[PDB]
Symmetry: C2
Subunit: 110 residues, 2 copies
């Protein structure tokens, strides 16, 4: 437990990433972050600067145990597309080839 | 197990979201997705269209068990900022007030 300003930091609590790295100063924006183990009934998200502090709003129901898969995308068939093209992205199990419902993803021209 | 083209889909496999909804048709882009339970040794990510298919590249080491927190951002102190301002975002446990290392987030003007 190392000191950090007016509070203590621990290696036990860790944020891996935030889906977006920026947003409107107006707030009320819905984002999501990935983190190591936390207790949904005893956690919070804080935004701060040396002299300012604001808390994010969420409920226990917004804390989900999920699996995150980091991956590199395959290139699209045609690298010369002049317009955006949105394909399907889905999971597929190797053993029985069963898949998941797809989610859209759009390839952008060069 | 419902038919879907040349394969079968299941409610057992589910993608919740992809961090980015678009990217260069050139591929080789590093993205990450959230999904329900999968077996790291028996899963894959596919991008496709009716007549095209490409697989994403990742290893078992890229499949992580994580906790995802959905939340709404607090507004920034000053809604009149003319330039970008990047603050700190971190987790904080309510019981003992212990925090996590911060991650940057930048508020953008209106």
């Amino acid at each position: 437990l190392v000191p950090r300003g007016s509070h203590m930091n621990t290696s036990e609590l860790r944020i891996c990433r935030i889906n977006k790295e920026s947003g409107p100063c107006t707030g009320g924006e819905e984002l999501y972050l990935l983190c190591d183990k936390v207790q949904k009934e005893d956690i919070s998200v804080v935004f701060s600067t040396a002299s300012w502090e604001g808390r994010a709003d969420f409920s226990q129901a917004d804390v989900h145990r999920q699996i995150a898969i980091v991956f590199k995308t395959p290139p699209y068939e045609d690298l010369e597309i002049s317009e955006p093209v949105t394909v399907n992205v889905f999971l597929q199990r190797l053993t029985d080839g069963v898949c998941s419902e797809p989610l859209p993803f759009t390839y952008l021209p060069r």
